[PDB]
Design a protein around this motif. Structure first.
Motif, PDB file in Angstrom:
ATOM      1  N   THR A 129      27.906 -65.155 -61.580  1.00  0.00           N
ATOM      2  CA  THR A 129      27.925 -65.135 -63.039  1.00  0.00           C
ATOM      3  C   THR A 129      28.125 -66.529 -63.620  1.00  0.00           C
ATOM      4  O   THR A 129      27.425 -66.926 -64.557  1.00  0.00           O
ATOM      5  N   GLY A 176      41.488 -85.609 -65.257  1.00  0.00           N
ATOM      6  CA  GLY A 176      42.287 -85.839 -66.447  1.00  0.00           C
ATOM      7  C   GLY A 176      43.581 -85.051 -66.431  1.00  0.00           C
ATOM      8  O   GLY A 176      44.632 -85.559 -66.823  1.00  0.00           O
ATOM      9  N   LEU A 177      43.522 -83.802 -65.978  1.00  0.00           N
ATOM     10  CA  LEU A 177      44.693 -82.936 -65.921  1.00  0.00           C
ATOM     11  C   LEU A 177      44.619 -82.099 -64.658  1.00  0.00           C
ATOM     12  O   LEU A 177      43.673 -81.326 -64.478  1.00  0.00           O
ATOM     13  N   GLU A 235      32.280 -65.461 -48.786  1.00  0.00           N
ATOM     14  CA  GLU A 235      32.474 -64.506 -49.864  1.00  0.00           C
ATOM     15  C   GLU A 235      31.169 -63.890 -50.340  1.00  0.00           C
ATOM     16  O   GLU A 235      31.193 -63.027 -51.222  1.00  0.00           O
ATOM     17  N   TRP A 269      32.774 -66.359 -60.383  1.00  0.00           N
ATOM     18  CA  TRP A 269      32.550 -64.944 -60.631  1.00  0.00           C
ATOM     19  C   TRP A 269      31.086 -64.663 -60.953  1.00  0.00           C
ATOM     20  O   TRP A 269      30.674 -63.512 -61.087  1.00  0.00           O
ATOM     21  N   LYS A 313      43.111 -64.594 -52.956  1.00  0.00           N
ATOM     22  CA  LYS A 313      43.631 -63.496 -52.150  1.00  0.00           C
ATOM     23  C   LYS A 313      44.395 -64.029 -50.950  1.00  0.00           C
ATOM     24  O   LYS A 313      45.531 -63.620 -50.685  1.00  0.00           O
ATOM     25  N   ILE A 315      36.765 -64.822 -57.724  1.00  0.00           N
ATOM     26  CA  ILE A 315      37.667 -65.493 -56.802  1.00  0.00           C
ATOM     27  C   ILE A 315      38.111 -66.815 -57.404  1.00  0.00           C
ATOM     28  O   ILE A 315      37.493 -67.347 -58.328  1.00  0.00           O
ATOM     29  N   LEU A 369      37.668 -59.238 -59.206  1.00  0.00           N
ATOM     30  CA  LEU A 369      36.236 -59.216 -58.935  1.00  0.00           C
ATOM     31  C   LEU A 369      35.724 -60.610 -58.594  1.00  0.00           C
ATOM     32  O   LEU A 369      34.952 -60.781 -57.644  1.00  0.00           O
ATOM     33  N   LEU A 424      38.731 -62.098 -63.080  1.00  0.00           N
ATOM     34  CA  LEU A 424      38.136 -60.810 -63.429  1.00  0.00           C
ATOM     35  C   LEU A 424      38.867 -59.662 -62.741  1.00  0.00           C
ATOM     36  O   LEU A 424      38.247 -58.741 -62.209  1.00  0.00           O
ATOM     37  N   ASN A 425      40.195 -59.715 -62.750  1.00  0.00           N
ATOM     38  CA  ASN A 425      41.005 -58.691 -62.097  1.00  0.00           C
ATOM     39  C   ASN A 425      40.589 -58.520 -60.640  1.00  0.00           C
ATOM     40  O   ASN A 425      40.499 -57.407 -60.120  1.00  0.00           O
ATOM     41  N   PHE A 462      28.748 -65.077 -52.120  1.00  0.00           N
ATOM     42  CA  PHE A 462      28.154 -65.531 -53.370  1.00  0.00           C
ATOM     43  C   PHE A 462      26.855 -66.283 -53.115  1.00  0.00           C
ATOM     44  O   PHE A 462      25.829 -65.997 -53.742  1.00  0.00           O
TER      45      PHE A 462
END
Ligand SMILES: CN[C@@H]1[C@H](O)[C@H](NC)[C@H]2O[C@@]3(O)C(=O)C[C@@H](C)O[C@H]3O[C@@H]2[C@H]1O
Ligand SMILES: [K+]
Ligand SMILES: [K+]
Ligand SMILES: [K+]
Ligand SMILES: [K+]
Ligand SMILES: [K+]
Ligand SMILES: [K+]
Ligand SMILES: [K+]
Ligand SMILES: [Mg+2]
Ligand SMILES: [Mg+2]
Ligand SMILES: [Mg+2]
Ligand SMILES: [Mg+2]
Ligand SMILES: [Mg+2]
Ligand SMILES: [Mg+2]
Ligand SMILES: [Mg+2]
Ligand SMILES: [Mg+2]
Ligand SMILES: [Mg+2]
Ligand SMILES: [Mg+2]
Ligand SMILES: [Mg+2]
Lengths: 80, 200, 131, 87, 163, 134
Positions: C74, C83-84, C42, C131, C115, C102, C100, C97-98, C44
């Motif tokens: 970011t 725990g959960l 990706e 992100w 995706k 992943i 942007l 981020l809509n 990053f």
RNA sequence: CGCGGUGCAUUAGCUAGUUGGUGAGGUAACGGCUCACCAAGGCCACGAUGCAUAGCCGACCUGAGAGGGUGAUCGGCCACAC
RNA sequence: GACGGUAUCUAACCAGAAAGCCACGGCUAACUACGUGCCAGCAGCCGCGGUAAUACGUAGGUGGCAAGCGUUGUCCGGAUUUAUUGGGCGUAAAGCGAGCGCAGGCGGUUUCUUAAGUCUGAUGUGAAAGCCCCCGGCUCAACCGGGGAGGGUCAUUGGAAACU
């Protein structure tokens, strides 16, 4: 033909003749927080010859009422 | 209930010409009352949004409850700007259709015509000024009513039919060819502030 | 005692990224490698390499900073925790981020991004957001 | 006994009816077994929508149409079909 | 940096605070004005001005705001994505809104967005209501916003590849 | 708290109480108990009438009546408007609403209902104070 | 019969046909359903028991949602008829 | 054919019989006059009234809504004010005085397998009415009718094996 609910579980009481008390040991998600919580259900199953002892993993099939609390019939003894 | 008080005071309170002629605003373009002519303090954002909402509903002469319900319908429309669609529904309102066709000088006059039943939609009588007129429906004057001075005066006086409308004088038959466009609608109004007002 | 090495991995990256360190190192685990390679493909993280030692191995990550030393990553966020747990159905896969960012997800089809998961129309366990 | 009858719907002075199979003891607008058609008397030619297959099946099973439902099934020819199938 | 010139800027007075300094004799009242000046096209800033008189305070804040203009990304009539800006007690959450919905926000956030040129957005104030802090928090969130092209460039992938 | 802590002891919310409790409870003569029935108003008999001194910031003689309600609870109610026809043993209707000035008054005496005569010469906000349109 | 939907632990022990078995009787039918004998078992901090409150639901109000509140009218089920 | 000469339609006559309610200090759209003088009184909160009150009473204007309007009562919201989504605990409320530890909660890396959790397909069911989406009918709407969708930590059954 239809089928009756069959559950695996552990014997926790066999001091009663012709019967045993099993435990189902399922888990459920908390409605609010969603975490899985240890949930224990115990059934009174009819034993034919007191073959099952305490702490034995057995299968039980639901049956017609047999006593005040019996609704299950022992099928298998999977562990001792 | 229907509003029947003075029109100039309402129009000059709104600050925009409801009739579109500007006659009310020509002389003494202040809000009504003794405090109109003199200086007045700045308007809050709430005042501005309320003023825009009042502009629309006073333009179309609707009560707040009916106005609010129609606003909800416009939201239900899935595509396009909510405020633009709201104004589109306001236009398709039956009274405004008569007014746009020019069969009445004023929206109040068109509303009274509809209420008294002198209008017919596709040859059928309709006494509901709130009636929703779709694109392609033919609005005609009641045959018994076609020979009356008021509508005759209105038709001769009227000279501009909007682009989206099409009218026939001899038959007194009109219809919206298409949905009105944003610019075709009243530009002085900002539907965005009305949308935000009802968002509360 | 450490209870979530995945969260520790994400936090190692976050701290190193915050100080703009060039590289970082982590104890090697299968899921850690899966996350690292997802970030690698990706774009990053600049690069990934794996070292083998006598404990469990090691994974070294080279961070990516844009022009003017701008931070590409970011932030990172652990979604499913010991725990959960967080499980999402096919239609529940989120968009970071809509789109942007992943979302790394673990599925019966492997460790995949949001995706890919929605393309395959499968759910899974939301391991992390990036992100 | 099992009945094929008209459950009243609509509004005041504007009746509408659903041809439904229900146990006779049930309330008129209450419990019912299955819906098999509709019936709008307000149209000059009364409008009817029917599931002929279901109606024939229930008649064979032993359902007793009410009077108006029987008229509807006759006008739709269903009663004749059931009659022939018995023959 | 953003140059104030070449931009037809317009201002709005968010709040006028009457601040007091106690002096031996008594009070020394002043006015502190918070102003947001924007471009309606993606540039906006905020400034403060303290002066004995309201007009002078407003003028000072306007000059400060012009000096502090910043650029806000905007996709269509709204922001690229959701964001939360935090400054002190200020905490503002801003989400993209569908076309035609309008600007759902409160007071100071409304001024920032309207002057910045956003016409459709949703937001909520999760922190304090102090005007200065909410304005500062709002601009923090807007600065956090990122452009699809910029993200595409930084990650080395096309915008289509990212999306 | 951890999710496990929440599971062991789930969140519990505060419980509100009515600012006008007397209206919330009815009375049953047969069982001689108090029922839990919410009522917009309640009838009562004025056991006393008089005036009270406001709290320190204000100074006036606020007009009040001590009323036993239909549920046998005794409360103090304010008398809005100017001048009243209320006297002890007068039947009144009470609505909710506090009085900031008064320490212990939580109910208002509806004007124009039962013995509560409208406010003479009232001409604005007539609905409140219960005077017919002149 | 599985599972779901109130508050209180300043309510912690409850149970003696009670728990199981063997018979017998009884029921449209299984069953301590009833009875005789045999044993001592059964439930319970995963909240028994006790106390308080309450008909349950489709639904209805609210909320951005998660949720919160309600359980009229209409439909289903249950229970009651001084 | 109870409704019932009811809906409905036609023709004639008349602007003639058919608008009130609350509010205008800020929150909050709406402002001035007198009368009053910490009194009378108002008030949801802030707070108003002590002789020049946009805050009380009245008048005139104005704002909101409309055969309604306002008050009270109750639930939800605003309230992130019990924060799972979505809060905190150095000094604002909040770390037990400390430790040892049953149960419980959680748990290092990896191979294979299992498939309870988890994801997924099929089937059955979650009545009707009601929300919601379409499409019709009532002059419009309310309302009515038709067709769908939705609604399950559901049951049976087939798959997937990353994680628990
Ligand atoms: C006795 N001299 C004092 C001294 O200069 C004070 N400043 C140090 C000065 O302070 C003033 O200017 C103030 O502002 C306070 C006022 C009470 O007296 C004023 O006059 C004050 C002077 O009277
Ligand atoms: K026996
Ligand atoms: K009951
Ligand atoms: K009884
Ligand atoms: K006021
Ligand atoms: K939380
Ligand atoms: K300590
Ligand atoms: K499995
Ligand atoms: Mg009306
Ligand atoms: Mg007929
Ligand atoms: Mg500064
Ligand atoms: Mg009861
Ligand atoms: Mg909320
Ligand atoms: Mg104002
Ligand atoms: Mg008043
Ligand atoms: Mg006044
Ligand atoms: Mg809440
Ligand atoms: Mg202290
Ligand atoms: Mg402290």
């Amino acid at each position: 033909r239809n089928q009756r609910k069959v559950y695996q579980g552990r014997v926790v009481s066999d001091k009663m003749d012709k019967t045993i008390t099993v435990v189902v040991e399922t888990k459920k998600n908390h409605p609010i927080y969603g975490k899985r919580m240890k949930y224990s259900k115990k059934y009174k199953a009819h034993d034919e010859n007191n073959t099952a002892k305490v702490g034995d993993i057995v299968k039980i099939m639901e049956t017609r009422p047999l006593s005040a609390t019996k609704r299950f019939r022992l099928l298998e003894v999977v562990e001792e | 209930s229907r509003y029947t008080g003075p029109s100039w005071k309402v129009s000059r309170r709104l600050g925009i010409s409801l009739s579109g002629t500007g006659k009310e605003l020509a002389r003494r373009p202040y809000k009504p009352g003794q405090h109109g002519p003199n200086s007045r303090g700045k308007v809050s954002e709430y005042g501005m949004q309320l003023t825009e909402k009042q502009k629309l509903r006073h333009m179309y002469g609707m009560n707040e409850r009916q106005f609010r319900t129609l606003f909800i319908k416009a939201s239900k429309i899935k595509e396009g700007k909510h405020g633009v669609n709201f104004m589109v529904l306001l236009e398709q309102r039956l009274d405004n259709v008569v007014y746009r066709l020019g069969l009445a000088t004023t929206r109040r006059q068109a509303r009274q015509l509809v209420n008294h039943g002198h209008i017919t939609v596709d040859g059928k009588r309709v006494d509901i000024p709130s009636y929703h007129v779709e694109v392609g429906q033919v609005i005609g004057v009641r045959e018994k009513s076609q020979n009356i001075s008021t509508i005759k005066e209105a038709v001769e006086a009227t000279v501009g039919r909007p682009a989206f409308v099409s009218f026939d004088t001899e038959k007194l038959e009109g219809s919206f060819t298409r949905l009105p466009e944003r610019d075709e609608l009243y530009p002085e109004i900002d539907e965005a502030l009305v949308v935000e007002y009802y968002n509360q | 005692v450490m209870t979530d090495p995945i969260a520790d991995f994400l936090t190692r990256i976050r701290n190193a990224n915050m100080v703009k360190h060039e590289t970082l190192e982590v104890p090697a685990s299968k899921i850690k490698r899966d996350i690292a390679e997802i970030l690698k493909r990706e774009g990053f993280i600049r690069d990934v390499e794996y070292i083998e030692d006598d404990k469990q191995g090691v994974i070294r990550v080279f961070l990516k900073y844009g022009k003017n030393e701008e931070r590409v990553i970011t932030n990172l966020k652990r979604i499913s925790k010991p725990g959960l747990r967080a499980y999402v159905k096919a239609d529940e896969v989120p968009k970071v981020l809509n789109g942007l960012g992943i979302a790394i997800i673990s599925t019966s089809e492997g460790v995949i991004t949001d995706k890919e998961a929605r393309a395959k129309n499968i759910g899974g366990e939301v391991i992390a957001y990036v992100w | 006994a099992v009945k094929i009858r008209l459950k009243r719907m609509g509004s005041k002075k504007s009746p509408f009816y659903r041809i439904v199979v229900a146990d006779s003891r049930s309330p008129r607008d209450g419990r019912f077994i299955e819906t098999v058609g509709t019936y709008n008397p307000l149209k000059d030619p009364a409008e009817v929508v029917l599931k002929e297959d279901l109606v024939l099946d229930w008649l064979s099973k032993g359902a007793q149409p009410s009077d108006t439902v029987r008229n509807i099934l006759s006008k739709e020819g269903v009663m004749k079909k059931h009659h022939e199938a018995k023959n | 940096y953003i140059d104030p010139k070449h931009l037809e800027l317009e201002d709005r007075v968010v709040a006028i605070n009457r601040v007091t300094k106690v002096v031996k004799g008594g009070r020394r009242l002043r006015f502190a004005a918070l102003v947001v000046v924007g471009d309606k096209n993606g540039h906006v800033g905020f400034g403060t001005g303290k002066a004995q008189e309201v007009p002078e305070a407003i003028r000072k804040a306007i000059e400060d705001a012009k000096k502090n203009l910043v650029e806000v990304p905007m996709v269509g009539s709204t922001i690229p994505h959701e964001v939360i800006g935090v400054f002190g007690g200020g905490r503002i959450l801003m989400k993209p809104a569908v076309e035609g919905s309008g600007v759902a926000a409160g007071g100071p956030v409304r001024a920032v967005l309207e002057l910045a040129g956003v016409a459709d957005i949703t937001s909520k104030s999760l922190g304090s209501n102090t005007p200065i802090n909410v304005v500062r928090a709002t601009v923090e969130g807007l600065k956090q916003l990122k452009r699809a092209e910029e993200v595409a460039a930084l990650r080395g992938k096309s915008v289509e590849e990212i999306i | 708290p951890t999710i496990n802590q929440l599971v062991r002891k789930p969140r519990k919310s505060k419980v509100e109480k009515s600012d006008s409790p007397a209206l919330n409870k009815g009375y049953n003569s047969f069982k001689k108990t108090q029922t839990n029935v919410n009522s917009p108003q309640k009838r009562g008999v004025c056991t006393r009438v008089g005036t009270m001194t406001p709290k320190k910031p204000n100074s006036a003689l606020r007009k009040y009546a001590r009323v036993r309600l239909s549920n046998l609870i005794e409360v103090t109610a304010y008398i809005p408007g100017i001048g009243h026809n209320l006297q002890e043993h007068s039947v009144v209707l009470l609505r909710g609403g506090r009085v900031k000035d008064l320490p212990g008054v939580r109910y208002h005496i509806v004007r124009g209902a039962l013995d509560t005569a409208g406010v003479n010469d009232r001409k604005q906000s007539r609905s409140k104070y219960g005077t017919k349109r002149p």
